[PDB]
Amino acid sequence: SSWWSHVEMGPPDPILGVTEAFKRDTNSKKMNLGVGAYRDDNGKPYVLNCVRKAEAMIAAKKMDKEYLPIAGLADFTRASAELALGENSEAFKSGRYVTVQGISGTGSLRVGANFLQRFFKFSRDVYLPKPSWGNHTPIFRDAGLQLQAYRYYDPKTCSLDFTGAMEDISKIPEKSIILLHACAHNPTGVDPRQEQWKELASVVKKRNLLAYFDMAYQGFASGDINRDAWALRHFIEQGIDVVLSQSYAKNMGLYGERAGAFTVICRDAEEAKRVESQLKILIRPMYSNPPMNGARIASLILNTPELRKEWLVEVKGMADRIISMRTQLVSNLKKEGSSHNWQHITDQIGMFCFTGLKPEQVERLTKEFSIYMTKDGRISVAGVASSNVGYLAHAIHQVTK
Amino acid sequence: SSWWSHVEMGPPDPILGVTEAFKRDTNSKKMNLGVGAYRDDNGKPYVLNCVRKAEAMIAAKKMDKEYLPIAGLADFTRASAELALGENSEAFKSGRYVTVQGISGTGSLRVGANFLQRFFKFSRDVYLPKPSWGNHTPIFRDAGLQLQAYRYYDPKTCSLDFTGAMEDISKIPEKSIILLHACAHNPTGVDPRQEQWKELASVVKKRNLLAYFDMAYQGFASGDINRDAWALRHFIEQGIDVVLSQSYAKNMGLYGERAGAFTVICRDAEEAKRVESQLKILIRPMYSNPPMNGARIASLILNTPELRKEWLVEVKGMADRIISMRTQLVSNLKKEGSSHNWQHITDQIGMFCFTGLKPEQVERLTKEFSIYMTKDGRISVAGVASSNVGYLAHAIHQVTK
Ligand SMILES: Cc1ncc(COP(=O)(O)O)c(CN[C@@H](CCC(=O)O)C(=O)O)c1O
Numbered sequence A, B: 001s002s003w004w005s006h007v008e009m010g011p012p013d014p015i016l017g018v019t020e021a022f023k024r025d026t027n028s029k030k031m032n033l034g035v036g037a038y039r040d041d042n043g044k045p046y047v048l049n050c051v052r053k054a055e056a057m058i059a060a061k062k063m064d065k066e067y068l069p070i071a072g073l074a075d076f077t078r079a080s081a082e083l084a085l086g087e088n089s090e091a092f093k094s095g096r097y098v099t100v101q102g103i104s105g106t107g108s109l110r111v112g113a114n115f116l117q118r119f120f121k122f123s124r125d126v127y128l129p130k131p132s133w134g135n136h137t138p139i140f141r142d143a144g145l146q147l148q149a150y151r152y153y154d155p156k157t158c159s160l161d162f163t164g165a166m167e168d169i170s171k172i173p174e175k176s177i178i179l180l181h182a183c184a185h186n187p188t189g190v191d192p193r194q195e196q197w198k199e200l201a202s203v204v205k206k207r208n209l210l211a212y213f214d215m216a217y218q219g220f221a222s223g224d225i226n227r228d229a230w231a232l233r234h235f236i237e238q239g240i241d242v243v244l245s246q247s248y249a250k251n252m253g254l255y256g257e258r259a260g261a262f263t264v265i266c267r268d269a270e271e272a273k274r275v276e277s278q279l280k281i282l283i284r285p286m287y288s289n290p291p292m293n294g295a296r297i298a299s300l301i302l303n304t305p306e307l308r309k310e311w312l313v314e315v316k317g318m319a320d321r322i323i324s325m326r327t328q329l330v331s332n333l334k335k336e337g338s339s340h341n342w343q344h345i346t347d348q349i350g351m352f353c354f355t356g357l358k359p360e361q362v363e364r365l366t367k368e369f370s371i372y373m374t375k376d377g378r379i380s381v382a383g384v385a386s387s388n389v390g391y392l393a394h395a396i397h398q399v400t401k
């Protein structure tokens, strides 16, 4: 009877644990379609060209490794706000915001939840869409908040249940917290249409709710960064002061570098200053100061005109390839003789596809084909290459035949 | 009346905030002796040679930026345990441990506190020495634990109050948590003597306390890594299963890279496995997976025989320089005509000096001389160069005259 005799064997993560399982398989034809990580057309990890250059400029400069401020690299911080907000924005222009470097999307999301837990005096509930990224639950839960739900996806029709969302949202108690995915809803790949977003704006405004946006896919929904940030900006411009989390893990392929930011839209710059003081106080005893690498890379790209333009071309390239794989998938399915309607594959946007497969089908896929995906039927289309799209379709067909 | 009208202006960090203040000063002769960051003999940030090479090997390899496992880079993780434990250790050999990559010292410390908060069923109290690094308080406090204190430093005699510590420690209630600094006690720079550590071992064993070690200075106490890790290893070998946090920020000059690890000594490997599962579950919703850069660098150095040896020479070099500055300081003080006994300057070990200056003297120092240090009289001797040791002594003398 030692200290940890009672600690139990916890289970593996529903998403991250897939990669652990995929690693052990000996089948040469294995495919890792669990996590949303982009693969090039050869089915290989892709480090952006602009990233490589940025790295190079950093090396040549013979930079130090000194501790960054608690809030992160200023240059990175101001650049992220700008990327989210837009240069012409009154919020940005007026300096009514505070952005703080975060440990990617998760760390930012968590700093925010913890910030909310500590300063959001009007409520303890966070409303998540149905469904939502698995990780949103434990992030809010460990921070000290309560979880709720609003309707979002309708599996009968493979779309957004707008009537149900509006109903649910219009009943949420005033001053509660609502979580919205900025674009490329994970894992459904279905987003509200702009007119749809306009309507949601009204109700969130009308009910006086704190809108918390999760932006991990800026540039993967349409292949355009300004376009993908529309809703976010529309809310701010309607008078809604949101909070927001950003990730550069996908859009810059900075996965393991862990670069991201958490922002709060305030009333003035003086308010901004005070919010800032408290976020730092919260960050200090968590990890003290953030990791410099990803931040340095991102800043360099965001702040160097030629690198920035290069980056945008690269973002289109990535999105377009994804479209291409979706298209080929459906076509191979038809070719293989599948009867099912696979149109949702091509209707959905972002990195994934919310297929519909039942858990028995998923099991098979892994066992007979060594195709790894999450148990809910979500697959990573982004990790499909010209060379294995055929194997994929054949498997999907076999298991669905 | 917006969302954050009530949030108040918090104060700047007692340590980190010094650098913020130092940044704004226009005096050309300014010195930043607040944070413990090593400066070379020209008074410049120093990036180790081995670090540079490691970076180079990484570049040339054209490595990916894919997400690391939740627990960190295996190679880094096994290497850290080994560096802490020693290669011949039964704990290491038997695999009765679990090491997890952490966001430097602070992140590791915090993961551990949170782990404790959640699984340490025998108590909510953490006993800190008097005094202790300012940051230890809020780290435990935000995690959900209660803080206590044990006597340690005696300001009358500029040493370790052993009688007082033994008294206090022998009264701590069984099964409580005790925090010990492995070597180079921050901020006193006074450590127990080996025979002293042997005695403390007994009592911690006798009272059945969970010993939590904070090792951020392996190699700065004596200039020898195996020697600096003596106490830690002695406890383990006496049958004490400790928990431990490591930082590579000073000893590898990885400051902003944020590399570190948290380890738990278990009873068996099966226990290790279960503890592991739960740490991952705790890490997942905090930041998801750790930053790769510092980890990749550290692993490369730790695991490449020639780099490792190089690193050790570099560690001696750093420690020796520190000794040199201490020596010069005292000598300049004598030369300037100071009457006070400054022997503690040279008696103390690690990166700092616990000077004795009252807060009025510290104020002066900053105002008239632009010498920045923490309010408790702690200065960073490590950041002193041959060129400004004289200015320092003159100031200290003027303000103390
Ligand atoms: C909506 C959303 N927010 C935040 C994040 C976290 O991004 P980081 O910057 O890496 O923390 C993800 C990642 N979604 C993923 C990647 C795997 C995971 O972290 O669960 C996905 O759905 O596979 C996400 O989809």
Ligand SMILES: Cc1ncc(COP(=O)(O)O)c(CN[C@@H](CCC(=O)O)C(=O)O)c1O
Binding pocket: A287, A288, B015, B016, B034, B035, B036, B037, B103, B104, B105, B106, B107, B133, B135, B181, B186, B214, B216, B247, B248, B249, B255, B260
């Ligand atoms: C005992 C101890 N533990 C943990 C840490 C944290 O190290 P990180 O890996 O950077 O998180 C420090 C840093 N001590 C410092 C550096 C400034 C600070 O973080 O307070 C010092 O005392 O100046 C420390 O002295």
